[PDB]
Symmetry: D3
Subunit: 157 residues, 6 copies
């Protein structure tokens, strides 16, 4: 009954995210993708859109499920009877901030954070840079799942 | 006649800050905590919270400031800054500012790492965690923690 | 015929920027300084271009132009496929590397990084403006014509 | 059935190592601590294994084994394909990342990194031995049985 | 008449190196690969072997040549009428040391150093890690040019 | 009665080191340069070179040391170390040692960046460059530079 939570805003999910989801699902009995929402700032995609895009690109992972939440990540994790977070690393990750949050999260709730580096091919995509590049016409089709790419272009138009 | 200034917004002061204050006060004759001024606490509240937490440091005082930090330092006859390092410090930006501050006013900056126990608290993360019900009581002065609970509730 | 683009907001241009411009101009047949405008700063795009031209008067193979949108489009539209970017103290290098890999992926454009000289390594447009606003002397860190204009915008 | 390997020389095992072992054992069905021998240190491989077993007596799903050669072969030979590595102050993380990407490429093995607790973040096997050699007290940073053995090797 | 020097021990050359050579050759009129030799410590390959492996994998680059040297890199550069170095960045690069050397090299000889990141696919290979992995049987065939791989295995056997 | 120890091998002392010594001497009543002991110069040579370069610093002295740095510091009634930062400093390792030194002996470590002009020299790189005929005269005290040329030629 091992398990981990993969957290993020996933606005939208990228192939970097999906790589890490797949690794987590391969190494833990269950994985929950936590789509964390700031109720004060809307992103590009609604919560239901974000969840749909993740589900469509994770259909081959039988032990992965997707749920939204807000507030403290460690509460989302513990209320599901888990105490592990799996977080991806990419080029441009603020690792010092991630470390700070990992030590705080262990301190307040006993939850462990495991970091895994995304595959090199997917190491320079981020939701924010993908959106920025696509806004001005750049081709990010190879860095996003099919469940995302044309929906992104749709939002931008 | 040695002295150093420990600058920050301290909104609120943490045990990470206090650890650095104590070290500065142990190694310099005179220490001034510079409360540099839309956060949670007013300048007076932040000053009071620091003063309450530093009552056992006779050679430390707390003053508010505006404008260039180096002017604050120099106008008090000093030319040293002591700055703490924690997990999540943007050290590259601190180094840029240190070199600029030396260039424009001949002020030295000394960096000291906070104790491991207080290395992952920051004013911002403490406020965030407490806002959502997390227990940060081990990371703040007893006084500050009660005040924080007051501002939230 | 070789060439590179040096991109930035240059608000205002610093001696750190100038150092990198000079090194680019010494190593490439053609250099374009791209003054890239956003939706915002202290100097107008025209003022920024003028300050750069004043500072680069001795560089005959360097020209200054404004641009918007995707940097790699600016680069490719001028028949080039290289960017030269400066490094200074406080550069977010991890983000620069992310953008370099992205720019190579989407358009085949290479990015070359060069560290500015130690003397000019701690100036940035933002920090120079901040220090000058409160009366600090940054005249050793900016071209002379820029320092004059900066005082005017503040006074 | 999930599982991971925690690799190192562990000469000697520290409380930083133990912290990471405990977290691995709490999150994976099976953990193997791989004591990997080189062509060399203070403690023999047998002594190191014994010190780890003493320290991990409360972890029934963790076992300790020696190994040589390619780590990913050690991992795959035991039917696993995950490594759990600790991070501390002074870890060469850039090199760890290079090795993680290499290990994924050559064998499909994933590497998960976890930071040790702040209290145990500045101890390392090498620095503990160095401090103890000159009479510094590192007893708060090592399992009790290790600290006893360390004194013996020095005296 | 622009030009740059790409320096290294290249013992052996990797596909990470070759990527950077190709970019340099695309952006400068001439490129010299400088195979820098420590006369006090032999590597795995002799100088002539190193040069042969680079030449065989750079035959499509008409403006690139390969030469060995020792002592100060800036003297190698200036004696060829050049004053630019192009150096690759990969995962595990000691960038702070590279920066130190770049500032020293500018100080003593006026030579500029341009850094370029290797392609993600080739970002985790290094000569040393390739040799180490191959020593213990790991498959590094996709990270090295054909001019290198079986020669490497030969040395190891 | 403030004081700090500036430790290193100083083989040889550079202008980067000297800049940090001067800053330490400006901000602490008492400074001890600890020459911690197969390099180029003997301990006595390194001490002499530092003493020659610091003749204008009345509150600085130079002594050799062995074993734990914290014992060197504590045996002289102090509990502060001042360490310089340059381009190529392994800062993560320095932080590890600082936290260890605080833990085992209550000694604080203050870090200060060298001036930009002296930020890319190190004893090792200076020796390497000079060995192959490079001019490092702008990066070393005048005395040291002549001595270095002597050891090579
Ligand atoms: O996208 C990022 O900034 C980092 N990152 C990359 C993969 C991944 C998976 C889960 C959470 C974060 C992740
Ligand atoms: O809180 C931070 O971000 C860093 N930090 C830690 C202690 C301390 C004391 C004075 C100034 C900053 C300080
Ligand atoms: O100013 C910066 O943030 C970095 N930087 C320094 C020189 C330079 C030249 C072109 C672009 C950026 C450059
Ligand atoms: O000791 C180190 O250098 C890092 N480190 C810390 C805990 C731990 C556990 C397994 C492997 C390495 C680990
Ligand atoms: O291999 C390395 O350590 C770094 N690196 C990567 C490509 C490349 C090309 C020339 C010189 C060094 C280079
Ligand atoms: O030289 C170095 O590696 C760092 N560094 C620079 C100045 C200085 C002074 C004392 C100790 C180390 C110092």
């Amino acid at each position: 009954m091992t398990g981990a939570v993969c957290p993020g805003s996933f606005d939208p999910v990228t192939l970097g995210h999906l790589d890490v989801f797949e690794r987590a699902a391969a190494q833990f009995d269950e994985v929950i993708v936590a789509v964390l929402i700031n109720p004060n700032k809307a992103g590009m995609f609604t919560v239901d859109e974000r969840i749909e895009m993740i589900r469509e690109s994770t259909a081959d992972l039988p032990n992965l499920r997707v749920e939204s939440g807000q507030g403290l990540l460690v509460d989302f994790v513990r209320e599901r009877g888990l105490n592990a977070i799996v977080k991806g690393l990419r080029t441009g990750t603020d690792f010092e901030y991630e470390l700070q949050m990992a030590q705080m999260n262990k301190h307040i709730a006993g939850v462990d954070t495991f970091f895994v580096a995304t595959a090199p091919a997917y190491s320079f995509v981020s939701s924010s840079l993908a959106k920025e590049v696509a806004t001005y016409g750049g081709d990010v089709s190879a860095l996003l799942p099919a469940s995302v790419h044309q929906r992104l272009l749709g939002k931008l138009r």
